[PDB]
Amino acid sequence: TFGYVHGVSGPVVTACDMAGAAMYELVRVGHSELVGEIIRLEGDMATIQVYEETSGVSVGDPVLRTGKPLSVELGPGIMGAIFDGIQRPLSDISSQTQSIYIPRGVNVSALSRDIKWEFIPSKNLRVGSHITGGDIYGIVNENSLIKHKIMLPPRSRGSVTYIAPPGNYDASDVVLELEFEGVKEKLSMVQVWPVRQVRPVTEKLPANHPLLTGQRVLDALFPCVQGGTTAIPGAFGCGKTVISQSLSKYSNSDVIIYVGCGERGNEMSEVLRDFPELTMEVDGKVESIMKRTALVANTSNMPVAAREASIYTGITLSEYFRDMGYHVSMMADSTSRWAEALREISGRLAEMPADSGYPAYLGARLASFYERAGRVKCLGNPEREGSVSIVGAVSPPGGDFSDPVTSATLGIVQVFWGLDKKLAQRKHFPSVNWLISYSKYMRALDEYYDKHFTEFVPLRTKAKEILQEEEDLAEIVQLVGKASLAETDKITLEVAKLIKDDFLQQNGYTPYDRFCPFYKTVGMLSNMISFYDMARRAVETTAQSDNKITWSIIREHMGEILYKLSSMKFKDPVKDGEAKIKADYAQLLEDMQNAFRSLE
Amino acid sequence: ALVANTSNMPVAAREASIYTGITLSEYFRDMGYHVSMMADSTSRWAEALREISGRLAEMPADSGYPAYLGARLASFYERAGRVKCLGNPEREGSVSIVGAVSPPGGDFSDPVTSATLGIVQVFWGLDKKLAQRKHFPSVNWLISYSKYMRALDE
Amino acid sequence: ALVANTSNMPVAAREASIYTGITLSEYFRDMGYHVSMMADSTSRWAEALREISGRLAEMPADSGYPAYLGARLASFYERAGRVKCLGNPEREGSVSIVGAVSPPGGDFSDPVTSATLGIVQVFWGLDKKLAQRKHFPSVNWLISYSKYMRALDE
Amino acid sequence: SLQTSFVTLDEAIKITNRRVNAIEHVIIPRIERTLAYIITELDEREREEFYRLKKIQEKKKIIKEKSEKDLE
Amino acid sequence: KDRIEIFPSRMAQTIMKARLKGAQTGRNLLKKKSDALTLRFRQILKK
Amino acid sequence: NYLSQPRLTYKTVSGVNGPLVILDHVKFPRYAEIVHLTLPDGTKRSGQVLEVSGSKAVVQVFEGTSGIDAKKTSCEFTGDILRTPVSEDMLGRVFNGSGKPIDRGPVVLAEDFLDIMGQPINPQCRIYPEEMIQTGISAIDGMNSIARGQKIPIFSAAGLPHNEIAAQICRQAGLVNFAIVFAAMGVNMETARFFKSDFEENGSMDNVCLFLNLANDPTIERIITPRLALTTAEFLAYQCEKHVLVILTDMSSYAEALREVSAAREEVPGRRGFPGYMYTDLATIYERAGRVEGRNGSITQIPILTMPNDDITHPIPDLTGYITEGQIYVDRQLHNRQIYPPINVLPSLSRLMKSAIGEGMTRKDHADVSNQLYACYAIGKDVQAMKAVVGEEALTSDDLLYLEFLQKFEKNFITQGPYENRTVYETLDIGWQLLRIFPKEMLKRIPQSTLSEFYPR
Amino acid sequence: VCLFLNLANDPTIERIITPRLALTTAEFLAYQCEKHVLVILTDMSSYAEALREVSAAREEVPGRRGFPGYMYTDLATIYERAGRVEGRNGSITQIPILTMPNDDITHPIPDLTGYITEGQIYVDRQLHNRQIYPPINVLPSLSRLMKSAIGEGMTRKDHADVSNQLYACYAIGKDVQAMKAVVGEEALTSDDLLYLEFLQKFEKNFITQGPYENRTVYETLDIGWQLLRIFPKEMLKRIPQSTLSEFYPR
């Protein structure tokens, strides 16, 4: 089976007797089993890019091939796991080695063996039954939330020769046996998939439903669809946690995957410390969010190939959960750190530089990753839908979007929540700059809003216009002062102030703003814009009259409605029923209508 | 007379096209005609010299162009002039050569532009600012020059 | 004493002049003399190291210079200092080194300048602005530095 | 005195705002577009150097391999 | 026209960063001048 | 006649390096021939021989080399270059980047096999293009007229609505029978749906052929994607006398495929790391356009490209700009103000507008109106740049009229609905209603006869 | 005279030898035949382009901009064949000429040349577009031997002082010319306006020669003092007050 080391130079290990080896095959080098990829073949010889430090590898050392390219073990026991970028299990490395270090050349099986999982076979199946890739042949109760749908691997097919009865089985127990063309395949709960290959689908559907974040600016003005591709300018001064924690606690995705792309050592431990302590309410129980996520963490001194692979590992996990019919959300907290790892591989391969020193294929390696998002009809027969949403942060130096990883990312992602240090310094959380930010999914979500929130598309359009008018009017205020504006424009600044101060801002540490349902979000904006339209009608109806309405008259005779329009943020879906909340909003609409009717 | 070799015709044939055009022009010059030779771009000629160099693996100078690019252009433009022709009857032929260099990115720091302006006595530098204004012919009258003016004053 | 290599002397003779100079300076330093040595430019030595490296088919590092340019300059400048001389009469000689550094095109980001600034404790930054106004001796008192102030205070 | 002061301040504000906007919309944009061109062409020279050094390194490896084959 | 056309070099990158800091400092110094003049100008108009 | 000799198949993979497999012991290797590779797991792949030397054939593999094996890989050499199967039955169909069908129809039952590279159209047989196409869009038809047989690309900054403009041109294009070949290189699936949907919504399927290479499809297929589209367009125009329009979407994703292949090959780099031959390769795509003597056929092309970082001097727009007959530009300075379609006239030109206008084609005034609209819009931008320094109080009343012209112009000439179709004659009447903003004597690009025939009306 | 001609149509490699033939003839005429010799080398850039052609064809490791790394020593074997020698009356003066590519003073050809040659005479596009013949920009021009070519008995004794002051005045002239745009003409003081008048009068009278005017050193310094007399006496700060009292009141 194995070859022998012929030469070593830095991480490059040339091996011989490798006549059976394949391009990008995964190889273990040396007596310590150091990981590496074959980057060239030259006869019976192979050149291996060893990931880990090769110091101590010798000529004549064994070179053991795995029968596979770089691949992710998929199966039960992912939830709660922590992985490096190449799927090695950092929690289990810790518990087995009892060391603060990863030992060079770990061989710990990625999904923990020996855990007998509770398995229920898919009760419709029988010996002699037909089956195709993506058929759910049984369910594993790995945690309370995520019933793990075991499925036939996408390339496997045939007739079921055996299925295991209900019972407890570990990942190496043969749960299914099937036959095709007279050839038997024995099959386990563990499933191996090539990480740089897209898990296939019945069809990638158009994305049409909101990925609700529970955050007013993010859900109202810049919506991301389930299946959406999005970016965040993740940098310290902007408060990036406001999105990622809110998504993690509240958002309407059944599973989450985190990729530490290549983050600073201490910033990595913040993620790994924090998430275990976060919790969600499910069916009125409180449970740790680690019940529904896996953290593919990588510090900056993890192997280059692990950082470059880490993004592809996280999406390959996310695609397995998508194929279980779950909606995954995938956070990628610095695509720039991944692009540096990619640049280092290209540099070590002695390839020619392109834009700003990045490789030629940076555009393709980004685009072919973001195209792994979307809603799908899964493979296999229970017709189930699912999705992956990719929330891939960017880190343009000095905020300069001309940086090729940032520019190519903004050339691909349909949504960009442009967090800004100027807003974060003012504590305007969630700190999203609404002038910078955008979403392309507005058109595709019209179906959803038409069915469920039919007035909201008008309100969203009016809100964006009022905010744009605030920035335009602010130039006139800076030139000639607020006193010089028309009455319409003065009330436009007052409503834009309410929108900026009490709609778009949301302090997630407060019990009332921990989350914000879409109905609460619509009701708030409906009242602010109802006030805007009634104030604007009162002003415009009294245009060229003797007695004329103005912001000061409105504030004098109905400053209570201005106070209520701010106060509506404090309403609490936990303490207040939906009917109570909706009724208070309806009462404020009636109150403001009577109040304006008393003037004009 | 035309010597075509359009952008999608074989790269190598661009060299032969230029040398064919000046060979014809030198022949009509030896008859005593005042020939003019147009060349629609010396940079697209020099890109043929770049391609052959890249296939041969010769070392590039600036921007990939071969180091002999200067000498190729020099031994092209110096085929101009007015001449007392060979042979018995005296004739005053000429070839006037007009190479329409097309600098990549529009940037006159381009090695073909730099080598070309080293050799030629007349430089009609066009400018995209004028062409955007629809100011045509788009000659920039600051950067352009004609070294022949002292002879033409006579 | 003078070691004198006109620029047309062979590339290796330019390197030898530096090592000869410091070895003579160290020889008189061992006599307890407070030797001083001045080089006409360490950049001209680096131009010798460049040409040597190229001819040997070495991998260059920046602007054709060898990567070991820094280590060469250190094996020159770190032969300076005061010393307690070897052997029996206790005497304290020194070699002061004034290594000049005009950079290519006047660019103070240059490898031999940067490598020199990583090693020398004093930088008499002469400046074109002062020289153009004919201010002499033309030292820029805002770019220049001398780390020795900490010792000289005693 | 207020009249002469007011008129003089109006002219001084116009002169100052012309300089401020000429800095903001002429001088700074010439410099930032120049600095982008400098960073671009500096990186072009860095690629042209990289490619020459890489092709040299490949020819050396060929010459080494040929020199070992010539021992047979 | 659109650029200063100093020839590409690490010297020129240093000089253009210095020219940018110069021009940006000049903008800030003249912005303080414009603000102080604007305040006095509006005071005088009321007087 | 058919090649009667049986095919050789080799396992002699002497190496693999990047996207290249290096066969050895090959019997008389043929440059640019196609290899079909079977990997150890039985996956089929295809490749083209980029170099031959004695017994060696260096084959580039389109699906990439991941999984190629030095012993268990079978390379069948077809003994011939890559030929596209073509037929008129390719209208109303959808193909992937390598020309396999994805509409769930059968393979192309060929009327012929054509060399994917095409042939160089003989400059003596090329007709100079001159019959006008209305696109229906005023910023094109009024100031950048497209001739039947012209190639003229739409440049755009990233994320601008260039797909919508190109879709609208497919909906509204006509003379003052037709077919489309649409290709996209590295298009995201969200945009691939838009293009396929729009042809289905317009009822156009019966006279459009789509080649889709998606942004995750193997990046070497992008090199053949527009070549397949052109080879179909050449069949439809030059053999079937169809009036063809070819749309090539993100020639930037094509140029990225050239840059990736160039890196893998180690070619001499030009600017921004694109290969030194990027002009010739782009010409091998773009020059497969125009009318040809004795044929009623014609290939029009409207390529589209995303200008990287909006830079007009970038090699992709720049080399395309050298090869193509003027260009149509789309701008953020229009799109941010919601001016659809966001076409900026000022950097735009159409080289064939200097012929596909005037009597029998368009109204007499057209050339004059276009030139005066260009002057007024350009002066409008110049006085806007003055206002940004010295304020509007320094501008003359004439200069203020050019600034007001620039506003009225964008609001009426450029601004147009996504389904609104305008004739050239309607566009010129709009042009005059804008020119009437100035006193007659200021119209320095228009002759006194054209003013006397059209200015007061 | 003695002319060697390689023209732009003659083969590249001959022009590598052309300058060495000229200098070898100059060594015979100077150092064996006692001639005072001037050597003119008409385009050192075409010489360096010939080195780049052969170097690239030899597959040698490049220096910056792809020239052979040895071009400094090589250009030295050309430029160092100059100057007087022991016992000889003869002398090889050289005035090489060098086509700066892209107008770039820092280009490897002029850069390595500037290190070997004893200054440079710099001819500027800006002065040429103004029709100033010869277009020599005095500021970037230098001459290392000037400090020993000039002085009592070699010239009139004031010649160093007048030239030093004029040179600083031209430099200040170009700086106030930059101020006239960056800050405006209205920001200039009476002194800055006198440096601007100096810059204009200096180009007109000092720099502008005409192609057959053969001015003596005395006519040059006399025009120099007629220009320095534009300023108040106290502005001539580089000149010693002894020299000013002899030559300013003229």
CSV table of C-alpha atoms in Angstrom, one decimal, chain F residues 132-233:
chain,number,residue,atom,x,y,z
F,132,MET,CA,-29.2,49.8,-38.3
F,133,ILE,CA,-30.6,47.7,-35.4
F,134,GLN,CA,-33.0,49.6,-33.0
F,135,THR,CA,-32.3,48.2,-29.5
F,136,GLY,CA,-35.3,50.3,-28.4
F,137,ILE,CA,-33.1,52.1,-25.9
F,138,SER,CA,-32.6,55.9,-26.5
F,139,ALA,CA,-29.0,56.1,-25.0
F,140,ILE,CA,-28.1,53.5,-27.7
F,141,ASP,CA,-30.3,54.2,-30.7
F,142,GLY,CA,-30.0,58.0,-30.5
F,143,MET,CA,-26.2,58.5,-29.7
F,144,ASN,CA,-24.5,55.0,-30.1
F,145,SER,CA,-26.5,53.4,-33.0
F,146,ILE,CA,-25.7,49.6,-33.5
F,147,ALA,CA,-25.1,48.3,-37.0
F,148,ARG,CA,-26.3,44.9,-38.2
F,149,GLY,CA,-23.0,43.0,-37.9
F,150,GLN,CA,-21.3,45.3,-35.4
F,151,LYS,CA,-19.7,44.0,-32.2
F,152,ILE,CA,-20.2,46.5,-29.4
F,153,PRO,CA,-19.9,45.5,-25.7
F,154,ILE,CA,-21.7,46.8,-22.6
F,155,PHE,CA,-19.1,47.7,-20.0
F,156,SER,CA,-20.3,48.0,-16.4
F,157,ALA,CA,-19.1,48.5,-12.8
F,158,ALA,CA,-19.7,45.4,-10.6
F,159,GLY,CA,-23.4,45.0,-9.3
F,160,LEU,CA,-24.9,47.4,-11.9
F,161,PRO,CA,-28.0,46.1,-13.8
F,162,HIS,CA,-26.1,45.1,-16.9
F,163,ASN,CA,-28.1,41.8,-17.1
F,164,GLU,CA,-31.3,43.8,-17.3
F,165,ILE,CA,-30.0,46.0,-20.1
F,166,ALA,CA,-28.9,43.0,-22.1
F,167,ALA,CA,-32.2,41.2,-21.5
F,168,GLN,CA,-34.1,44.4,-22.6
F,169,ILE,CA,-32.0,44.5,-25.8
F,170,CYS,CA,-33.0,40.8,-26.5
F,171,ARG,CA,-36.7,41.8,-25.9
F,172,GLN,CA,-36.7,45.0,-28.0
F,173,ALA,CA,-34.0,44.5,-30.7
F,174,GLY,CA,-35.1,44.8,-34.4
F,175,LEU,CA,-34.4,46.4,-37.7
F,176,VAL,CA,-35.5,50.1,-38.2
F,177,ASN,CA,-35.3,36.2,-39.7
F,178,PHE,CA,-33.7,37.0,-36.3
F,179,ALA,CA,-32.2,34.7,-33.6
F,180,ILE,CA,-30.1,35.0,-30.4
F,181,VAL,CA,-27.2,32.9,-29.1
F,182,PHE,CA,-26.8,33.8,-25.5
F,183,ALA,CA,-23.7,32.7,-23.6
F,184,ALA,CA,-22.7,33.3,-20.0
F,185,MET,CA,-19.3,32.6,-18.5
F,186,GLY,CA,-19.2,32.1,-14.7
F,187,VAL,CA,-22.7,33.5,-14.1
F,188,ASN,CA,-24.2,33.0,-10.6
F,189,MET,CA,-27.3,30.8,-10.5
F,190,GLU,CA,-29.6,33.7,-9.3
F,191,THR,CA,-28.7,35.5,-12.5
F,192,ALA,CA,-28.8,32.3,-14.7
F,193,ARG,CA,-32.5,32.0,-13.7
F,194,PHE,CA,-33.1,35.6,-14.7
F,195,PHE,CA,-31.7,35.1,-18.2
F,196,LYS,CA,-33.5,31.7,-18.8
F,197,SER,CA,-36.7,33.1,-17.4
F,198,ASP,CA,-36.7,36.3,-19.5
F,199,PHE,CA,-36.4,34.3,-22.8
F,200,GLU,CA,-39.3,32.1,-21.6
F,201,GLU,CA,-41.4,35.2,-20.6
F,202,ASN,CA,-40.8,36.9,-23.9
F,203,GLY,CA,-41.8,33.7,-25.9
F,204,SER,CA,-38.3,34.0,-27.4
F,205,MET,CA,-37.2,30.3,-26.9
F,206,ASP,CA,-38.0,29.2,-30.5
F,207,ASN,CA,-35.2,31.6,-31.7
F,208,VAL,CA,-32.7,31.6,-28.8
F,209,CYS,CA,-29.9,29.2,-27.9
F,210,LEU,CA,-28.5,29.4,-24.3
F,211,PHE,CA,-25.0,28.3,-23.2
F,212,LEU,CA,-24.8,28.5,-19.4
F,213,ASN,CA,-21.5,28.1,-17.6
F,214,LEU,CA,-22.3,28.8,-13.9
F,215,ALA,CA,-19.9,30.5,-11.5
F,216,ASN,CA,-19.1,27.1,-9.8
F,217,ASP,CA,-18.8,25.1,-13.1
F,218,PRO,CA,-15.2,24.1,-14.1
F,219,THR,CA,-13.4,27.3,-15.0
F,220,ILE,CA,-11.6,26.0,-18.1
F,221,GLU,CA,-15.1,25.5,-19.7
F,222,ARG,CA,-15.4,29.3,-19.8
F,223,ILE,CA,-12.7,29.3,-22.5
F,224,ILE,CA,-14.9,27.1,-24.8
F,225,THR,CA,-18.3,28.5,-23.7
F,226,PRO,CA,-18.2,31.7,-25.9
F,227,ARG,CA,-16.4,29.6,-28.6
F,228,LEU,CA,-19.3,27.1,-28.7
F,229,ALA,CA,-21.8,30.0,-28.8
F,230,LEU,CA,-19.9,31.6,-31.7
F,231,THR,CA,-19.6,28.2,-33.5
F,232,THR,CA,-23.4,28.0,-33.3
F,233,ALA,CA,-23.8,31.6,-34.4
